[PDB]
Symmetry: C4
C-alpha cells in the first residue's frame, strides 16, 4: 500500500446523482438504530462508509430523551456500511467524544475525537485503530473540529480545529498529521474572521476547505491548504450567493475578505466545490431555518464578488428538514478525475419537532455526473407522529 | 481474476430441486426484517445472494403502512446471504432506487438502480461498489429495467431498459456495459411489440431474455442477445402454453411475432429456459391472479406454435400467493453444464390481503436436477392474522 | 488444502470437560432467536460451529405456535458460531429441508438436506456451498438421515440414510460421497435390524456410527464403515448397559445381533465412543423419558455382552430435560490423538411442557479430558413461566 | 507470525485519555445487550476487544432477574468489538464458565474459563480457539483466576489462580502456559498473605501483577513474575496510599510485607502501574463502597512505605458507581514504549440499586498520554428508573 496523492482534477459537474441514503429515522421507528447527529461519509481504498456521532442510545430507547444535548460522555464517532442505518449491531466505534473528523491516507485511517468539559477538552488522534497523539485545549472553550472527513496527500493529513468563542474571535489552528503524529501546526492566517466545522476536499491544486463563520458572516469562509509546504491561506467566498443559514437575502455584491452582515451568532456546517467555471455551492433553501437543500452552479464563486447561478439542482424540498452538509470524495476510484460528492444531514426531532423528546437524523448523499440528469427530492421520510 | 465466458450449455432438466427459501414474512412477524418486493438471486464467483428492493422500513414498523406504493425515495436495492431473510442488520445496500438489475462479470459486480419522479428518472451504474456511469430518462415516463440479474460474457453485460407507456408502444433499449461503462446501446428491434422486466440467462448460444408484454400480449416476448457482436433479435414464445398473468386459456396455436390477445394493460414478470427439447416454461397456475406456480416442459416452445407440455412440476399450490419470477444461474459452479435456476416472489399483504396495510414478500428458489425428483409445494408460510 | 485423513486414535477419556453451551432458550425469551430442534456440532479446519434445523420463526414470534411439527416447508439446516445462540442475524443457511447431515473433508464442506412430502422426499447434496447431486426417495416413506455430522477420509464421506417404516423393517442405505458426487451406495448389511439417526466419528480404525433402532431394540445398533474400501458391517452394542430411550432396565446379558426387547416403536438419537478399554456410552438417566444425561465408561461395550460401568459422569440431572445426543470431533486440532466430543439437545416446550405452544431446544457440548475432572450438571436454564 | 517479547518500557504517564466506552446499560434499555460482569480489555496483534462474563440473558429479558448471582451454568467469557456493547448478535464466546483470563501471545490467543460447583471446579485452557489443557480444583473451594488479561513473553503466558478460602489462607498457584500447554506451576511464595483477581501487565523488567487480598489487607498484594525463568516473588504495595475497597483511611506509613488492617473479608479487583517515578495507582474514591474512581501518581509506591501522591486524575465521580478495574496494554502498537491502559467496570443494579432485579455493568477505559490532558468524568450514564 502507498500513500494517496492528489493527482487529479475534479470531474466536470453537470448534475448530481443519488449516491447513498440510509432512511435511519424511518427504520429506527422499529429497529435498534442509534440516535446520531453530525454525520458524514468517508472512503477507504476498498470501501466507503457513513460516519456520525452516536448519542449512546437508540431512538426508541428511553435514553433518547434529551438528545438535543451536544456534548455528553455517551457520544462516540461511529462508522457503518454505506446506506445501512447506524444500528447497535453494525456500527463500529472509531473513538470516544463529541466532535470528530476522520480520513484514510491510502495506507491506514486517522480518526480524531474530542471529549471533555467545556474548559478542559482534549483531542485524541487515532491511526490504524490505535491512539497515537493527543492535543489539550489551548483556549479552554470547547475545543472542536470539522465534523466531516479530512483529506490526505502523501501521508500528510491537515485538520482544522477551533478553540474559543462561537460568538467572537476564537483561536483556530491547522494541524498537519502523518501516521497520527503531529508534524506541524499553524495559527489561522488570512482574512477569514471566524472558523468552524470545515468541509474539505482535495485535488491537484491542493486542499480546499469551506467552513462556517458563526460570529458575523453569512458568507462562508474558505481555507486553502498546501499539504506539501504545510501552509494555508483564508478568505470568504466572494460570491453574493450566500450559503450559510440563517442568512440575509442574496445581494449583488458579496464579500471576499470580511463577514457579510445580517445574522450574528448562528450558522450551519456547509460546503462548496470551488473550481473556476466548474464551481458549485450547496445551501439550505430557507434563509431562516435548516430546511430544504439545493446546489447552485456559480462560476468563479470564490473570486468573483458579482457571481450568480447559471444552473442548479434541488436536493431536498424547502418543506423538508435538512441540516449539516459536507464534502467527501472517493479518492481511490478509477478514472482521470475525482468525482465530487456531498452528504446532507436530515435532522428530525428537536428543536423543530418537539412532540418527541429526541434529536436525530438520517443521511442522503450525492455525487456529480457529467450527464445532465433529471432531479428528484430526497426527504428523511419518517412520520414523526408514529413516534408519539 | 478473469472475466467469465459463457462456454457451457444448459444441464438437462429432468426436475427441479429446492435451492433457497428465506421465510421472510414468517420471521419478520417478530424480527427486524425489511419490507421488500421485486426480489431476485445472483451469484458472485464465491457466493450466491438474495436481492430485492427494500421499502426502507421493517414489516412490524409503522412505516410499513402504504408499501403497496412502487416508487418512493426510501427504496434501495439490497442483497443478503442466501436463504437468510432481508434484515436491517444483514442487508447490504447496492444502490438507491426503485428499479434494478445486478450481475457479476467474473471480476467485479455491476449494479444498476433507477430513481426519480416519473418524468425525470435516471439510472446510476455501479461497478465494484462505485458509481461509474449514469443514464437519463429518454422518454420521460418511468425509466425502468429488469428486476432480476443481468448476464455477462467476456466483460460485456447487456441490460434491457424500457422508458415510456406501460399500456402502449414504449421505447426499449438494450445497453451493453463493460466495467460499468457504456460500450453501446441499441433500440429494440424484432417482432416483440412491448417489453418489460426481462429475465435473462446465458449459455454458449448467447444470452436469452424472457420478458413481459404489458400492453396486449399474454404470451411472453423474448429477446436474444449476442454479447460479442452486441446485437439482438426479438419475438414471442411461439407456444400456445401461455405464461403471462393474467392470461386467456391455452389455445392450440400460439403466436410467434405478435401479442396473443385477451388481456390488456396487465402482466407479471416471468421467465423461461428455451433450449430445444430441454425447454421449460414457468407460470402462475391461476389465469386470473398471481397465485400458484408451476414449471412445464414444453419442447421447442420458442419456435413451435403447436407445442404442449410433456412433463411438469408444481412449485407453489394455486391456493397460495405467488408473484414475480425470474432466472439466474451459478456461472462459477463446477462441471460441464450450467444448472438452470429460478426464484418465485411470494407476495403477502396488499392488494390481495388488505387486512394489513403493508405489501411485502418472501422468496423461494429452485435449480434443475438430472434426476426425476419427487415434488413438494412451497408456500410463503406466514399467517396474515398474526399481523392484525 | 488437502483432504483430511483419519490417522489418529482416540485420546484417552478420563472425564469430560465443558466445550460449548448457547443458552438459546434463556436468551430467546427476549431476543430474535430461531426456533430449532435436531442440533449438532461440526468443525471446519479453521472453526467449529453449532448446527440445527430451524423452524423458520423465532421463539417469541407467533409462528412458534405448532413447532412440535417435524417436517414443514419452513425448515432449514442452519449453522452459527460456537456457543452463540441461533439468531435471525447470525445464522447461516446451509440448505433447505427437515433432515440433515454435514461434514468438512479438509478442503470444503458437504451439507445434505432432505425435503418433500412423506411419499416424495428428496435429498440435495451441497458441496462448497453449491448443490451438486440429488437423491430421490427409494421407499416413498420419509427419506431421512443422521441429524449429526458425517465423517470424511481422503475425500470420501460416508452417510447413512433410511427410507421406510419407523415401526418395522425399512430400507437403509450407506452412501459414499466425494466432492458432493455419489461414488457408491450399498444396502444395509449385518445384524442391525433397524437403523435411524446415526451418530458417527472417525479414527485410524475406520468410521464408527452409533444409531437408533426405532422398531424393537433398546440397545443401539452400530454401523462400522471402511471409507477406503467403501464397505460396512453392522450389529448392536453387546453391552447390557442399554442406551436408547425409552428402555427397559439394565439386564446382565445384552444382545450383540438382535434388538433387546421391552420397548417398541420409540427411541431417541444417541451416540457412543467404542474403543476397547477406552469405551464410553452416553444415555438419558431416565428409562422412561428424555430427561437427564450421563456418560458411562463401559470397557469393550461393543463386543462384551456382560460389560458394566467402571466410571461415569453426570452431564444433565434427571430433573432436567435432555433430548438428542450425537458425536463430533475437531479433526484439525493439534496433537497425537482425536479428542472425543458430544452434544446434548436440551428440549424445551412440547410435548413435555405444554403451557407453551412451541418446541425448541438449547445445546450443551463436552469434549474428553485426560484429567479426572470434577463434574457439574448443565441444564437448559430457561424458566418456562417467563414465556406465558 | 512470531511470539511477542516484552522489549519495551512503559511510556511516561503524564495524564490519561479516553480509550473506550460502550454505554452498555444505556443501550441495553432498548436493545439485545447481554447482562455481564467482570469485564476487561485485551489486544490481538490486529485488534483490541472488550471481554466479560455473560450471564446468558439480556438485561430486558426476564432471565436478568437474579443476576447478582456469581456462578451459574449460564455464564461464558465473551468478547466483542472495542466500545460496542456486548450484544447477543456481536458477542463471540471464548469459553464456558464463571471465572476467566485471556491473552494473545503474538501468534494465537489463550483463553481460560473455570466452571463447576464450589467443591469440584475445573479450568479449561483454550488456545487458538481449541481446548488444549484442563486443570482440576486442588483445594475444592471455588477455583478462580484473574478476571482480566494475562501477559505473554516469547510464548510463555503466566496466569495466577487461587483455590481455597476467601476469608483465610488459600492455595494460590502461578501457572506457566505455552500454546495452551502447562510448562510449569508453582505455589505462591513471598510475603503476600492472600491473593485474588490479579491485574497484570508486562514490560522489559518482567511481568507485574497487582492483586486483591480479600482476607485482611486493604493494601494490594503484588506478584512479580519472570516469564523466562518462570519464577516469581510477592509482597504488598508499600505505599500508605491504600487502594483496595472498602479500606481504612490513608495512614502515613504503609505495609510492604503484610496486610494493612481495618477491613476483613472484603475487597475489589484493582490494578496499578509500578514503575519508579512513573508509578500510578488506581482506586475507588469512596473508602466504603464501589463508587468513584481516581488515578494517583505515587512515586515508588511499590517500595516506599511513606510515598504520597504528587499528581492525580479523576476518572469517575464519587457520585457514580464503579466496580472492578484492571490493566491491559496494546503490545503490538508502534513506537518505543508500551502505553499503559486500564478499564473500570461500572456496576449497575444490585446490590446498590435494588429497584431492579438484575446486576450488570458497562465499561470505560483509558490509556496514558505524555501530554498533561484536561480531565473529565465518565459515568455509566443509564437512568435506573427507565428500567422500572
Ligand atoms: C428534470 O430535471 C431537470 C434537471 O434538474 C430540470 O431542469 C432544471 O430545472 C431547474 C429549475 O428550473 C434549474 O435550476 C434553476 O437554474 C437557474 C439558473 O438557470 C437559469 O438561468 C440561467 C442564467 O441566466 C442568466 O445568465 C445567462 C448567461 O448565460 C443569460 O443568458 C440569462 O439571460 C440570464 O442573465 C440561464 O442560463 C438558464 O437558461 C438555460 O437553462 C434553462 C433550463 O433551466 C433552459 O430553458 C434555457 O434554454 C437555457 O438552456 C436558466 O434560465 C437558477 O437561477 C435557479 O436557482 C434560483 O431559483 C431557485 C428557485 O427555483 C432558488 O431556490 C435558487 O436559490 C435561485 O434563486 C435564488 O437565488 C438567486 C441568486 O441570488 C436570486 O436571483 C433569486 O431571486 C433567488 O433568491 C431568493 O431565494 C433564495 C433561496 O431561498 C434566497 O436565498 C434569496 O435570498 C432570495 O429569497 C435554479 O437553480 C436547473 O438548472 C435545470 N437543469 C437543467 C439541466 O436544465 C427539469 O426542470 C426537470 N423537468 C421537469 C419537467 O420537471
Ligand atoms: C411424486 O413426484 C413426482 C414428480 O413430481 C410426481 O410425478 C409428476 O406428476 C405430475 C402431476 O401429474 C406431472 O405433471 C403433469 O405432467 C403432464 C404431462 O405429462 C403427461 O402427459 C404427457 C404428454 O402426453 C401427450 O403426448 C405424448 C407424447 O409422448 C403422448 O404419448 C400422450 O398420449 C399425449 O398425447 C405424457 O407423456 C405423460 O405420461 C408420462 O408420465 C406419466 C406421469 O406423469 C406416466 O404415468 C406415463 O407412463 C408417462 O411416463 C403424462 O401423461 C402435464 O400435462 C401436466 O400439466 C397440466 O396439468 C396441470 C394440472 O395437473 C396444469 O396445472 C398444467 O398447467 C397443465 O394443464 C393445463 O395446460 C395444458 C396445456 O395447455 C392444458 O392442456 C390443460 O387442459 C390445462 O389447461 C388448464 O389449466 C391451465 C393452468 O391453470 C390454464 O392456464 C389453462 O388455460 C386451462 O385452464 C402436469 O405438469 C409430472 O410430469 C410428473 N413427473 C414425473 C417425473 O412423472 C408424482 O405424481 C409424485 N407422486 C405422488 C404419489 O404424489
Ligand atoms: C467431584 O467430581 C468427581 C468426578 O466426576 C466425582 O467422582 C465421580 O463420582 C461419580 C458418582 O459416584 C462416579 O460415577 C459413578 O461411577 C460408578 C462406577 O464406579 C464405581 O464402581 C466401579 C466398578 O466397581 C465394580 O468393578 C470393579 C472392578 O475394578 C470392582 O473392583 C468393584 O468391586 C465392582 O465389582 C468401581 O471401580 C469404582 O470405584 C472407584 O471409584 C470410586 C469413586 O467413584 C472410588 O471411591 C474407589 O476407590 C475406586 O477408585 C466405583 O465404586 C457407576 O457405577 C455409576 O453409574 C451408576 O450409578 C448412577 C447413579 O449414581 C446411575 O445413573 C448409572 O446409570 C449407573 O447405575 C445404573 O446402571 C448400572 C449398570 O447397569 C446398574 O448396575 C445400576 O443399578 C443402575 O441402574 C439403574 O439406573 C439406570 C439409570 O437410570 C437405569 O437405566 C437402570 O435400569 C436402573 O434403574 C456412576 O457413573 C464417577 O465415576 C466418579 N469419578 C471419579 C473420577 O471418581 C466426585 O463425586 C465429585 N465430588 C463431590 C464431593 O461431589
Ligand atoms: C483541567 O484538567 C487538569 C488535569 O486534570 C486539572 O488539573 C488537575 O487537578 C487535579 C485536582 O486538583 C489534580 O489532582 C490532585 O493532585 C494532588 C497532587 O498535586 C498537588 O500536590 C502535589 C504534591 O505536593 C506535596 O509535595 C510536593 C513535592 O513536590 C511539595 O512541593 C508540596 O508542598 C507538597 O508537600 C503538588 O506538587 C501539586 O502542585 C502542582 O500542581 C498543582 C496543580 O494541581 C499546581 O497548582 C502547582 O503549581 C504545582 O504544579 C499539587 O498541589 C493530589 O493530592 C490530589 O489527590 C488528593 O485529593 C483528592 C481530592 O481532590 C482525593 O480524591 C485523592 O484521593 C487525594 O487526597 C486523598 O489522599 C491523600 C493521600 O493519602 C490524602 O492526603 C488526602 O487527605 C485524601 O485522603 C482522603 O480521601 C481519600 C479518597 O477518598 C481517602 O481514601 C482517604 O482515606 C481520606 O479520606 C489530586 O489527585 C491534578 O494533579 C491536576 N493535574 C494537573 C496536570 O495539574 C485542572 O484542575 C482542570 N482545570 C479546571 C479549571 O477544572
Ligand atoms: C460549541 C460551538 C458550536 C456553535 C454554537 O456548537 C455546535 C453547533 C451545532 C448545531 O448548530 O447544530 C451542533 C454541534 N455538535 C456543536 N458543536 C459542539 C462541539 O458542541
Ligand atoms: C411502471 C410500469 C409497471 C407496469 C404497470 O409497473 C410495475 C408493476 C409491478 C407489479 O405489477 O407488481 C411492480 C413494479 N415495481 C413496477 N415497476 C415500477 C418501476 O414501478
Ligand atoms: C468466590 C470468592 C470471591 C470473593 C468473595 O468471589 C467473587 C467476588 C466478586 C465481587 O466482589 O464483586 C464477584 C466475582 N465474580 C467473584 N468470583 C467468583 C468465582 O465467584
Ligand atoms: Ca453565520
Ligand atoms: Ca400481459
Ligand atoms: Ca428403540
Ligand atoms: Ca481487602
Amino acid at each position: 500500500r502507498n500513500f494517496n496523492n492528489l493527482t487529479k482534477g475534479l470531474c466536470t459537474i453537470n448534475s448530481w446523482h443519488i449516491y447513498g441514503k440510509d432512511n435511519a429515522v424511518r427504520i429506527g421507528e422499529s429497529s435498534d438504530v442509534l440516535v446520531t447527529r453530525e454525520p458524514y461519509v468517508s472512503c477507504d481504498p476498498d470501501e466507503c462508509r457513513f460516519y456520525a456521532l452516536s448519542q449512546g442510545t437508540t431512538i426508541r430507547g428511553k435514553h433518547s430523551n434529551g438528545t438535543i444535548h451536544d456534548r455528553s460522555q455517551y457520544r462516540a464517532l461511529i462508522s457503518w456500511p454505506l446506506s445501512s442505518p447506524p444500528t447497535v449491531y453494525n456500527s463500529r466505534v472509531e473513538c470516544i467524544g463529541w466532535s470528530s473528523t476522520s480520513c484514510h491516507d491510502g495506507k491506514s485511517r486517522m480518526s480524531i475525537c474530542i471529549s471533555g468539559p467545556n474548559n478542559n477538552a482534549s483531542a485524541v488522534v487515532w491511526y490504524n485503530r490505535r491512539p497515537v497523539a493527543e492535543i489539550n485545549t489551548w483556549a479552554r472553550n470547547i475545543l472542536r473540529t470539522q465534523e466531516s472527513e479530512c483529506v490526505c496527500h502523501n501521508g500528510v493529513c491537515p485538520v482544522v480545529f477551533t478553540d474559543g468563542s462561537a460568538t467572537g474571535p476564537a483561536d483556530t489552528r491547522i494541524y498537519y498529521f502523518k501516521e497520527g503524529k503531529i508534524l506541524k501546526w499553524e495559527s489561522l492566517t488570512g482574512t477569514a474572521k471566524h472558523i468552524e466545522e470545515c468541509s474539505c476536499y482535495g485535488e491537484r491544486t491542493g486542499i480546499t476547505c469551506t467552513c462556517k463563520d458563526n460570529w458575523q458572516g453569512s458568507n462562508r469562509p474558505v481555507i486553502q491548504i498546501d499539504p506539501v509546504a504545510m501552509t494555508h491561506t483564508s478568505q470568504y467566498i466572494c460570491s453574493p450567493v450566500l450559503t450559510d443559514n440563517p442568512r440575509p437575502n442574496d445581494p449583488n455584491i458579496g464579500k471576499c475578505n470580511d463577514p457579510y452582515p445580517g445574522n450574528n451568532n448562528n450558522g450551519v456546517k456547509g460546503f462548496s466545490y470551488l473550481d473556476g467555471a466548474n464551481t458549485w455551492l450547496g445551501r439550505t433553501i430557507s434563509t431562516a431555518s435548516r430546511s430544504g437543500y439545493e446546489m447552485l452552479k456559480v462560476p468563479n464563486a470564490l473570486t468573483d464578488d458579482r457571481s450568480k447561478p447559471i444552473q442548479g439542482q434541488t436536493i431536498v424540498l424547502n418543506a423538508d428538514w435538512s441540516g449539516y452538509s459536507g464534502s467527501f470524495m472517493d479518492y481511490w476510484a478509477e478514472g482521470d478525475c475525482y468525482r465530487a460528492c456531498f452528504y446532507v444531514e436530515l435532522i428530525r426531532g428537536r428543536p423543530k419537532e418537539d412532540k418527541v423528546w429526541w434529536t436525530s437524523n438520517s443521511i442522503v448523499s450525492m455525487c456529480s455526473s457529467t450527464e445532465f440528469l433529471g432531479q428528484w427530492n430526497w426527504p428523511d421520510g419518517a412520520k414523526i407522529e408514529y413516534f408519539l
